[PDB]
Structure formats: structure tokens, C-alpha cells
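Sample 1 of the test manifest.
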Amino acid sequence: GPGSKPFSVPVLTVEEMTNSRFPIPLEKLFTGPSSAFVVQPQNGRCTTDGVLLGTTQLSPVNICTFRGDVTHITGSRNYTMNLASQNWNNYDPTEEIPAPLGAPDFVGKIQGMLTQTTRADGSTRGHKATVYTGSADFAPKLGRVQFETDTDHDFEANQNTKFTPVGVIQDGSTTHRNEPQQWVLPSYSGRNTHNVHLAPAVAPTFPGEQLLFFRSTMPGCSGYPNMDLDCLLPQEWVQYFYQEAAPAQSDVALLRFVNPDTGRVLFECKLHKSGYVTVAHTGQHDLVIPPNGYFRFDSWVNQFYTLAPM
Amino acid sequence: GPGSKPFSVPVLTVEEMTNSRFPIPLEKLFTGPSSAFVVQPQNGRCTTDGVLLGTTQLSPVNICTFRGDVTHITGSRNYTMNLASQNWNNYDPTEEIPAPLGAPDFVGKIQGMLTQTTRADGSTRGHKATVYTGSADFAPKLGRVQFETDTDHDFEANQNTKFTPVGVIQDGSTTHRNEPQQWVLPSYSGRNTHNVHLAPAVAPTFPGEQLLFFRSTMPGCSGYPNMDLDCLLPQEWVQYFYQEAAPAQSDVALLRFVNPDTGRVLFECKLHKSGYVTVAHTGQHDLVIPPNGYFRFDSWVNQFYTLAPM
């Protein structure tokens, strides 16, 4: 970037920031144990010195979008989308990425709208549509995704078509909140293929520590979905580290979460250079924060620094 | 004072950035005359020293969203939404802004989805919905808007409801591309009321200059809409100026648009302190830019600096 500032984090409140895993605002901070799952999201991954990882790209509005053109599957209301790149050029499967940037990084049924414009006359059309990212034929890395829609006839072939995500759904005849599964990665090249070029899984290692999650509630569109969505970094931090690209002077940036209403620190945390945050706590806990609170970088420390409990 | 923290613009390409007037990426740059109509958008308004204006707020995903509770209009598929604030608290109509932050700043028919969760059991529902921002009863400043939907019964009252925008429609006539009207501000308190606390209208005043517009194509959902959408500043520039808060040393920052493939400047432009851009050109022109090109601040200059023609 064009500046010449030492390392910092942005002065932004949680509510001023955006989830890096779905195009919705952040609402709250949450910490819980993670030994019972694998935490390997591919969106919202960036080192503190500005290296984008996984499927992470810069604008939050592109997260969980797809673009391309569609072909109807006869005898259904389903369509295959042959993907374009984000700027409508040809999609290139040989790029060293797990999937097109911004592709969904969790297994679930994401609902939104497919929209389309006919080039010759500028006629337009749009329908509700869902992508099941755990389906065998979800293969964005190969350039193909299938959508279930509300039409069997009202999309043209060979015309620009976009999917805009809105929320998630669940089958209400089944155990409530059984999906989405935010920590289950899709198989980006389809069932029984191996993902490539992934951002690594993350876990706290220091005793007494847990991940700190930046949490939103995904809109629900049908049934009884699990709408919790946790990201490792706000999108604005991805954007800021990309732009600043300040070298990490140690493995960990010590951050204090400041309450400007009282002038006191509420808690401190470790921002790991590979791009995730830990805190000293044991158990599930919804943090209760001043709405005008923000994070502040105070010191470079190592991974063996002992945090004050919160 | 002299020696103030240096101003800059981010190193981001047009395609890496986001429209500040609808939650979609930027696609291109455009210049044309604007003397016959008023250019007074309320989103994407910020001074170079970081003062947000109009209805402008920080995250692009919130633009053209609404949140609140809904009330069915008997005998129709229409719902009144009684607005909440962006963080689900009560909305305050006496705040010194034109309308809730991020509200639409153009007259048009915006289609998306209304989604809702019932608190007691986590049941959910989602439906297509259109808001007409030129409607007599479009009064977001007062805390009320109307949505035409695809249901007459499947929303509950007194439960959190969100509108997520997707794109625009055209109907009510056979004249193509006559709407949306991107430079017509809504009457934010309803028909025959006066708007308040507006960001000012902008115009080129220097002979031979025109505004430079940051352009996207809104998705279309029905009919033959005009999908052009021009903002005065990318959302990332709003975010960056807010965060950096570098003092303006004059009223005009000279930017050069750099082509890293050649090392040479393609064009130069004026970034006015009050937050818009002009170029020296006469006529309508779609700029042909290298996709990796970006803007670079080179100097503060005087109001009446003469730009190189482009």
C-alpha cells in the first residue's frame, strides 16, 4: 500500500465490521472450545503481513456469489451453472487456489436469487434458488455448480447469470439446527476428490486458550437452520492487512479490547501472525462488549505469552 | 498543521473495489456530462479527511438493506415494515441524518428477499419482495416502507425481519430503461415532504471538466431496467478515508491512474476534498483501463489546476 505506518489493527467496532464468510455484518464476539471439530475455513484467511490465503478475496459482497451461464436439467427445476470468473471472464481451473475466490467454505443449503440479462434486448429475469454445497455435483473448482430453482423454463442458455446469496435453509422434518455445518469444508471438485491449496486448519495450543470468533447470524429462509457463522478475522482486517502489509515482528500481536466509555481494557487477546485470534477462557461464552469498543495493537509477543483470563 | 499525516488512496484496482450505492462490485470507469441534471447521491459520500456524509455508512453489505418488523396489508401481498436500526435496536427518526444509514438513494424498484426468524423455536421463512423507493408511502426517515411480496399470509408480526437487496426491476410501462432513475433522490419522509441533512449536490465547475463515475451494472430481476449505477467514490475509499483521517492540505488532490504493465500513467484526475472526482474530457466515454491499474496520490494542488486531457 501507499502508506508508511507501523503494524496496527483498524479502529472499528464489531458492529461496524463485516463477516468474512458470508456478506452480512458482524454482531458479536464468541469463544468456545474447538477440539471436537476442525476449524479450517477458507474465506476470511489472511496473514497479518497481508498474504491472502485459501479462497479469500477483498470485497465482502462477492462472498458466496457465483457468476456464469446456466443449462436446465430436464425433468427438474435444477440448473447447472458453468462458472465464469468474478469479472465475467473465462474461469481458469488451473489457478493455485482451492476454488473460485469467495466460493462458499461450508456445507449447507444457501438460498438466494439467480438473476439474468439477455444481451440483445436487455430483458431480465430472476428466481429464488438454492445451492447445496454438500451435493456430489457441487464442483466449483472444476467450474460447475448446480442450483435448485423455482422455475423449469425461465432461464435462457448462453447468457450472463448471477447468484446472489441471502441466507440458509434446513429440512424442518429433521433434527432442528442440524445444518448448515459451518465447520465442514465442501469438496470443491466434487464428491470423493481431494481439496487443494487450502489455508491450514487452526487450533489453540496454549493451555487455557480458545479461539475468539467474530460471529454473525445468517438469515434463515426455510426450516430450522443453525444460523451461527463464525469467522477468524473480520473482512475489514483482511482488507487492512492486505493494504498495509506490515511485517510481523514476532509470531503474535498482543491486542487489547478497549472500552472508550470507561477508559479501561475489557480483555486482551493474541492475534497470531498466520491470521487468527485466541483468548484465555474455558467454555462457551458470548462476550458482552461496549458497542463502541475496538481492538488496539499494543505489543509484539511470542506464542508463550500468558494472557489475562477473560 | 504543516507536515500533517500524508494523504493517500488505496492500492486497489477498480475490479477489486465495491460500489458505494448498491452492494455489488465495481466494473468500470465512465465519464459524461451531467449539467442537465442534479448529482446528489447520499451513499458513497465522504470527505478526503474522513467525515462521512449523507446516509453513508461503512460496510458495503448494508447498502439498500432494511431491518424491522412487518405488518400485513389485508387483501394484498403487501407488507409494511416498521424499521429498526441496523443493529436491531429501536430506530430514532430525530437523528440528524436524511434517512437510516445505507437506505437507497435513488428512485427505483429494488427486488430482493424478506427473511424472518421466529424467536421461540428458530423457525424461518423467506420470500421475494420489492420496494418501490418512489412510492408515496416510502418513508424510511419516518421508519416505514412497503414491500410487495409473493405471500399473503406467511410472515409473522412482531418478529425480526430483514430485506436483502438483489437487483432492480422495470414495470408499469412498455418503455424500456426508463427506470431506475439513479439521480432522483427519494423523498425520505414520504410524498410531499422535504429531505433533510443532505450531502450537497456536486458538479464540475472547471471549464472542460466532467465527473468521473465508478460504475457497476445492477442485476435485473424483471422487465427492461436501466441497470447502470454510478458512485462518486468506491466504498473502499470511504472506508480508507474514514480510517486514515489524513488532513487535506488543499481543496484538490491530484491522482494519477497507473498501469503497472507499462509503468506509465494512463490519465490524471482531481479528487476534491469534499469527496468526488473530475477529469478533463468532453463527451460520454467508457474508459479502457488495464485491469491491474490503480489510483495514486501525487500532490495537493490548487483549485484551478489544469489537468492533462484524457
